[PDB]
Write a protein that binds this ligand. Structure first.
Ligand SMILES: CCCCCCCCCCCCCCCCCC(=O)OC[C@H](COP(=O)(O)O)OC(=O)CCCCCCCCCCCCCCCCC
Ligand SMILES: CCCCCCCCCCCCCCCCCC(=O)OC[C@H](COP(=O)(O)O)OC(=O)CCCCCCCCCCCCCCCCC
Ligand SMILES: CCCCCCCCCCCCCCCCCC(=O)OC[C@H](COP(=O)(O)O)OC(=O)CCCCCCCCCCCCCCCCC
Lengths: 1054, 114, 32, 99
């Protein structure tokens, strides 16, 4: 380079800052001192060096003197969006009111008190505006270390969430107030009318969140339609964030920080649209960007302070700094204590230890430093330039040195860092198991031949994995049993979640319920009286909004097809969606003319504008008249039948009247009378009402979103209930193994069964209330399960080596794309008609001849409340298929009681074995049934005798139904999930007893064999066995004989 | 690819039967049988000598599977796996010669001389 | 901002370039 | 992970800048050699860190390409198309064939 060539020197400064940050982080990993203090010290040293050596000055001149606008616009959005993204949105929303009240009111009061203190105590003659700016700067916090400690010690997750949310809202509101008062101070603007100020406040405080919400909705919608593109998604996120901030702050002046906060929160909430790996990458990406910004700001502030602020300072400034530190520390605690009653009697409340921890955790961060730098650059006077930066940096340093270092000791003193004994025991057990496994592997390695010379010193270097942490009877027995139930429920929920069925919110709800039950004394988890109601409830004016939307939408069911003229063509054109599209296009086109006319009225260019506006208005009026002619004609009176069309007719009439009046205004009519001649607004403002004609399309779409939300709510509730049900079953078997003390097993089982039955009935009724959303939920679950199993099969095939990486990646990409497309599916589905329900029954599904034999046969029966479909002991004479409704079965089989719903059969066993009814079934709601006679069933079975015979399929269904409980009971803590047992039993088959005396060898491949309904004997003992029962491995050999009374039916696996 | 797609279809059918047998999921629309991600297969669409060629190819495939399994378990590394696969493919390309002659093709790496 | 206030206008250009690139990539995925 | 990523970025940019400006030397070749060497001995980096780094650098390159392509069109339309004759297109065709 030569002459005037500017080699960018900022690159060296930024790279050096990154290098110094890395060195500081690496060196002080163990020392309690935060590395930010080291960064500040290094920056100060660099500034002092540069103040003397001219060469270093050039490399620290354009970065230590940035224009404040660049600093803000480049750094603030990154920090704010990262903070919003990192937080856990759901827990934050669960206690939104507490955080909002705390943040807002505490910040306001603290800023006011700090401003008054600065005005009075300090000798600087400051007016109220400067003091308020000072307080706003000093009232911003940044609790990263405290949150990290609270998370790692695993105590009071809600406390960490509260702290994070309060910090976020505090930063946003502090930036808003600082902007307001900075504009007030450095850019005086005449007087301040009440109306102007009210409008300014309304804008800055409302338009921000609205703009952010709109941007977030649009960006989420676009993101949901991207498949197989990570770069596009990341770039979209970055561009959306920066454009939101920039446009909101500069054009259409609005609070940019609030908009970015809302956008980040919304994107965090609806993060299911993004692909998994993309979000995993995004987390680290934003974390790194925030780290870079923090490092740069901390390095810059030290240089700037050492070069400017330390020049102007007196002996009293340090005294004022000490006093200010004390005062702010006192003020934070005073505010928290004062607001304790309101947020404690309501919301979640606080404990004194939590209040102390919150008070001591108020560490100032980088936002205050950035604002101080802005203020310093905005002035050339010491009275506000040096003092602001000096005091801000001093407070930051004092907080970092003292509070950050002593937070751990304060936590220890309060006794909030103790380790629960069960956790210690679990860790010890895990370490012992790891040691045993390592010893076994070491023995196996030693036995080898190619590895015998290897040094065995590695026993010490084998990564021992030293365990961390260093270091009347009825009541206690009941407590132990309750804790055991808690643990069993937790394990069952966690296994279901890991398998991918328990979701996340449901798992958190279940774990919280279990922990709360454990905390309480003598009360089983999941009372179910109300704790399992609201989620299933899903009741709020959202349902009222849905009903109002449904009622508003009204139209003629049908219209006659006149034979005059063309006829069908005109009706099709009028009713075709093309007509609606044209109407919408015309409305959109006319909207621009209305806005143009309004702007012109409010404000040869004029002649051209008037001619264009008149031509557009005439064209729009002609189009509206043509559209009206399309209707009315043929429809006749039907055109006026719908009250909605009345608004369109009125709009067209008004537009035509205005156009006619404006065209000539010479024929007569009003003329001299007050009209558009003197005030033409009435001839144009009413044109805006044409836009309202589009509201007809808005009503349906709105319903959609509402349905969506409803679905989600219901969806979640549904899932949670199912979880509990399944969990209970598992615990059931577990409850049999332990305890061993009678009169307690009843204590647990009574509650378990009562809760299970109540939840089952609630779910059945809730589904019956909303027949639509249930179908969608079930379909989504089925698709998810099928896709998961297909992906597992693909992984197994790839691992076996039969598939190359190219094909495996292709199949995985296809599966991922299909899953993502599934994530965006219609909220509600129309329930299938009964005929397809009958055609989809598993056992008769297949050959179409059987479906014909059934559909041509059968009958439909209607029942009402309290109708007894079947009487206990009544001879089995037919089946039943629940095509709609819900029934309750009661009887002795332990007086078992259960509920059944749509898509279930009833009397299979009676037909297959000709036995009296099992339990009496009574309708709990108007029900519809399919009743297939026993005689017709026997005729069908006799007619069809192919290899997959109908009788064989029915017996297979019955056997698989019976077998599951026994295999589940076999699980004595081994772990089977009650679902993998279903898959294991699926591969089984019935006994093909061609000869009565088969001797099926009991090899290790067959695993287990069950006795469904029959008599089997051992090879040696030939012990008599009566079904149902599991043969068990004790009977080594399984011979057989031809029984007479009961035909022997056995289920076997291999 | 055809074999893999057929196996995936069989697994999907078994899972569909298991789901249908369930009780809490009977009303769910079974149109999914079409929307269940069929995973349509891509690509659309003297005896002694031949027997020996088939046996050589079978040996090639067996060696490839063994190397792939060992690498997946985390023992065969990557460069070694690439060397073995290249040797197998070159042997396959040539006619009537077993993979890994070992005469010189397995010497330089053990050599380490320079 | 007032007087001589330089609001960085590079941000708008860079963000618009990213948006246009994303749109172009998404639209012409199938076209050669 | 943040330290590793920052170290990579700073090393790359410092290498190029220092090599090109101070002690005049071919910066591009130095960066090429540094990238190749780091790629070869990538076992030092942790697995997840390298997985992240691949996508990070890919995205950065994509951003640079997009910016350059967008800028070139504006610059050409504003400056180059002003000066052009009927023979320039003929020369363009001939040059394409020749290369
Ligand atoms: C540390 C990261 C890896 C290594 C460095 C990566 C690349 C660094 C450059 C990034 C783009 C900025 C180039 C500098 C601007 C050109 C003009 C100039 O410097 O002349 C002074 C320039 C020219 O105008 P004048 O001096 O007013 O005449 O001064 C200004 O007015 C603007 C101030 C420019 C410096 C602003 C601070 C840096 C902004 C970006 C934040 C840091 C990078 C974030 C992370 C990026 C990677 C992920
Ligand atoms: C006045 C302030 C409010 C003005 C209107 C805000 C615009 C609407 C914001 C989103 C509300 C609806 C979200 C959807 C929902 O309810 O479910 C949550 C929804 C998730 O829905 P899910 O999919 O069912 O989980 O997303 C959220 O979590 C939204 C929460 C973020 C927005 C509210 C919090 C931030 C408010 C702005 C800061 C406080 C105001 C400061 C004003 C004074 C400053 C000096
Ligand atoms: C698209 C990515 C997300 C959205 C944007 C991210 C942040 C964008 C800003 C990055 C830092 C540069 C700030 C602008 C420099 C300040 C001074 C200025 O603009 O005035 C003109 C500035 C002031 O000097 P004067 O105009 O000569 O008086 O003009 C110059 O001489 C320097 C030219 C500055 C623009 C250079 C091009 C941009 C460099 C960075 C490459 C793009 C970002 C790479 C990806 C980053 C995220 C990973």
């Amino acid at each position: 380079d030569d002459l005037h060539a500017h080699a960018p020197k900022v690159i060296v400064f930024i790279s050096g800052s990154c290098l110094f940050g890395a060195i500081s982080r690496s060196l002080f990993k163990k020392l309690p001192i935060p590395y930010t203090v080291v960064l500040l010290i290094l920056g100060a040293i660099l500034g002092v060096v540069a103040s003397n050596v001219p060469l270093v000055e050039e490399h620290t001149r354009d970065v230590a003197h940035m224009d404040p606008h660049v600093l803000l616009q480049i750094f603030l959005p990154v920090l704010i969006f990262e903070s919003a993204f990192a937080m856990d949105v759901h827990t934050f929303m669960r206690s939104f009111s507490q955080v909002c009240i705390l943040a807002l009111f505490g910040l306001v009061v603290a800023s006011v008190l700090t401003a008054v203190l600065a005005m009075n105590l300090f000798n600087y003659n400051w007016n109220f505006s400067e003091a308020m700016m000072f307080g706003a700067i000093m009232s911003a916090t940044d609790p990263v270390a405290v949150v990290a400690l609270l998370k790692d010690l695993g105590a009071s997750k809600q406390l960490g969430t509260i702290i994070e949310g309060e910090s976020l809202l505090n930063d946003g509101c502090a930036i808003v107030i600082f902007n307001v008062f900075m504009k007030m101070v450095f850019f005086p603007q005449l007087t301040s009318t009440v109306g102007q100020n009210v409008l300014y406040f309304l804008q800055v405080a409302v338009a921000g969140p609205l703009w952010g919400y709109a941007v977030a909705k649009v960006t989420v919608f676009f993101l949901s339609h991207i498949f197989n593109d990570a770069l596009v998604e990341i770039t979209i996120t970055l561009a959306a964030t920066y454009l939101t901030y920039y446009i909101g702050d500069i054009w259409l002046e609005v609070s940019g920080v609030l908009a970015v906060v809302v956008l980040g929160l919304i994107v965090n909430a609806e993060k299911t649209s993004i692909s998994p790996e993309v979000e995993v990458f995004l987390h680290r990406f934003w974390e790194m960007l925030a780290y870079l910004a923090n490092t740069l700001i901390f390095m810059m502030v030290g240089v700037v302070v050492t070069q400017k602020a330390l020049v102007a300072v007196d002996k009293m400034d340090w005294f004022y700094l000490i006093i200010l530190y004390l005062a702010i520390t006192i003020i934070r605690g005073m505010v928290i204590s004062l607001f304790s009653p309101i947020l404690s009697r309501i919301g979640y409340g606080l404990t004194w230890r939590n209040a102390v921890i919150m008070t001591w955790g108020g560490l100032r961060g980088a936002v205050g430093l950035a604002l101080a730098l802005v203020v310093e650059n905005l002035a050339g006077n010491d009275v506000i330039g040096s003092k602001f930066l000096f005091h801000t940096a001093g407070i930051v340093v004092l907080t970092l040195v003292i509070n950050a270092t002593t937070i751990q000791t304060l936590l220890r003193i309060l006794g909030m860092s103790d380790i629960s004994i069960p956790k210690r025991l679990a860790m010890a057990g895990a370490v012992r198991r790891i040691h045993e496994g390592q010893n076994r592997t070491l023995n196996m390695l030693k036995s080898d031949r190619f590895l015998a010379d290897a040094d065995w010193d590695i026993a010490t270097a084998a990564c021992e994995i030293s365990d961390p942490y260093s270091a009347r009877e009825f009541a206690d027995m009941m407590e132990e049993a309750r804790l055991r139930m808690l643990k069993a429920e937790k394990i069952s929920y966690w296994k279901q979640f890991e398998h991918g069925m328990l979701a996340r919110e449901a798992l958190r709800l279940l774990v919280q319920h279990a922990e709360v039950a454990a905390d309480e004394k003598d009360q089983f988890i999941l009372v179910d009286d109300l704790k399992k109601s609201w989620q299933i409830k899903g009741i709020y004016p959202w349902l009222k909004r849905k009903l109002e939307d449904l009622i508003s939408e009204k139209k003629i069911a049908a219209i006659p097809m006149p034979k005059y003229k063309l006829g069908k063509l005109m009706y099709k054109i009028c009713h075709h969606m093309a007509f609606e599209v044209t109407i919408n296009i015309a409305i959109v086109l006319n909207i621009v003319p209305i806005i143009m006319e309004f702007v012109v009225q409010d404000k040869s260019s004029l002649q051209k504008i008037e001619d264009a506006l008149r031509i557009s208005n005439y064209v729009f009026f002609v189009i509206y008249a043509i559209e009206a002619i399309v209707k009315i004609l043929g429809l006749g009176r039907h055109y006026i039948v719908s009250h909605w069309n009345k608004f369109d007719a009125f709009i067209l009439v008004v537009a035509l009247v205005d156009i006619i009046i404006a065209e000539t205004l010479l024929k007569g009519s009003i003329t001299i009378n007050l009209s558009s001649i003197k005030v033409v607004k009435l001839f144009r403002l009413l044109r805006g009402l044409r836009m309202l004609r589009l509201t007809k399309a808005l009503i349906p779409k709105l319903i959609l979103v509402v349905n969506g939300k409803i679905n989600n709510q219901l969806s979640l509730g549904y899932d949670v209930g199912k979880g509990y049900i399944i969990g209970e079953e598992e615990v059931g078997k577990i409850i049999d193994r332990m305890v061993d003390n009678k009169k307690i097993l009843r204590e647990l089982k009574h509650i378990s069964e009562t809760g299970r039955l109540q939840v089952v009935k609630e779910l059945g009724l809730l589904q019956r209330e909303h027949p639509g959303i249930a179908v969608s939920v079930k379909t989504r679950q089925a698709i998810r399960t099928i896709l998961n199993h297909s992906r597992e099969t693909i992984h197994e095939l790839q691992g076996a080596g039969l598939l190359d990486e190219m094909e495996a990646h292709k199949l995985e990409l296809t599966v991922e794309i299909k899953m993502k497309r599934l994530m965006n599916a219609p909220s509600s589905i129309p329930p299938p008609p009964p005929e397809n329900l009958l055609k989809n029954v598993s056992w008769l599904a297949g050959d179409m001849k059987l479906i014909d034999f059934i559909k041509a046969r059968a009958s439909l029966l209607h029942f009402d409340y309290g109708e007894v479909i079947v009487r206990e002991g009544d001879e089995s004479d037919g089946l039943f298929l629940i095509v709609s409704g819900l029934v309750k079965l009661y009887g002795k089989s332990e007086v078992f009681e259960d509920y059944l719903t749509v898509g279930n059969v009833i009397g299979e066993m009676g037909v297959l074995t000709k036995k009296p009814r099992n339990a009496t079934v009574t309708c709990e709601t108007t029900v519809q049934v399919y009743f297939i006679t026993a005689e017709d069933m026997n005729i069908a079975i006799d007619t069809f005798t192919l290899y997959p015979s109908l009788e064989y399929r029915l017996w297979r269904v019955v056997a698989i139904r019976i077998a599951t409980p026994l295999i589940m009971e076999q699980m004595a803590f081994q772990g089977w999930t009650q679902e993998k047992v279903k898959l294991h039993l699926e591969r089984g088959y019935l006994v093909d007893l061609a000869e009565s005396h088969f001797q099926f060898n009991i090899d290790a491949t067959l695993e287990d064999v069950i006795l469904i309904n029959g008599t089997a004997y051992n090879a040696h003992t030939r012990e008599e066995i009566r079904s149902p029962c599991l043969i068990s491995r004790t009977v080594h050999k399984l011979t057989f004989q031809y029984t007479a009374t009961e035909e022997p039916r056995l289920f076997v696996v291999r």
